[PDB]
């Protein structure tokens, strides 16, 4: 937790890697070591001690913090593989089993955070980055929305780590069909959809998806936080731990739905 006079004495700021709600992420070179990093530039408009304890293969490591008069600079492990949806769209062949492998990694990382007492609360397909352009690259959670936001939260009821399990279910849903489980033109009706947790595995998009996958999703996307699968429980579900995920090429439809619905 140092301070920088000119942050630029220490980092060479090159290109914007991406942009958040009210912060940008920048590719930089550590001038001291020549190591490439990703720097999160947060305007100034106890948890950082915890953020350094986070060390997991599927979580973007925070490597340092420096502060200037105007901003906070979070020096992050650089990830070079691009966003999750982009790879899926650009990918030639895509299966339920690829979806399951990604979900496994997210569950693994999320449970590890829950054991540190960290609740993500903003798990989104955007937060999910490939580690390299390697075809076999692992995925990683970058961060430390309607749709993705669990019913409890939107009901302004008491919420636990179970909120993150909801988000994971929403992501799994999108990963298998390319569109969000909740959508309406009127925000009011959308929120009511989310609050009632009423969604469908609607045909034709879901015809070729396994029942085990549907079972898996039903259990994460469960309105009652006390009924909802936890990370540990989702990990041991057959679709994740066994051999139920199918091998059919679902790329075309999912890819087209993603283009219709995101970026
Ligand atoms: N470590 C990283 N390496 C490479 N690119 C990153 C890294 N972290 C973030 N990015 C890029 O920045 C984008 C924005 O992510 P974040 O900055 O994670 O968005 P956010 O969830 O809106 O956070 P915030 O609300 O604090 O701005 C990502 O989608 C990705 O393209």
Author numbering: 10 to 54, 65 to 163, 181 to 299
Please share text taken word for word from the publication where this structure appeared:
However, the regulation mechanism of CaMKI remains elusive.
CaMKI315 containing the autoinhibition segment cannot be activated by CaM as the CaM-binding segment is incomplete. The CaMKI315-ATP structure is very similar to the CaMKI320-ATP structure and also adopts an inactive conformation. The bound ATP shows evident electron density and maintains similar interactions with the enzyme as in the CaMKI320-ATP complex; however, the phosphate groups of ATP have a much higher average B factor and no Mg2+ was observed in the electron density. In addition, in the CaMKI320-ATP and CaMKI315-ATP structures which are crystallized in another space group (P63), two pseudo two-fold symmetry-related molecules are juxtaposed head to tail in a similar way as in the apo CaMKI320. Superposition of these structures with Akt/PKB-GSK3β shows that the residues at the P(-5) and P(-6) positions of the substrate peptide would collide with the C-terminal part of helix αR1, suggesting that helix αR1 might exert the inhibitory function via occlusion of part of the substrate-binding site. ATP binding can induce conformational changes at the nucleotide-binding site and the activation segment, leading to the formation of an inactive, pre-CaM binding state which is represented by the CaMKI320-ATP and CaMKI315-ATP structures (pre-CaM binding state). Nevertheless, helix αC remains in an inactive conformation and the catalytic site is only partially assembled.
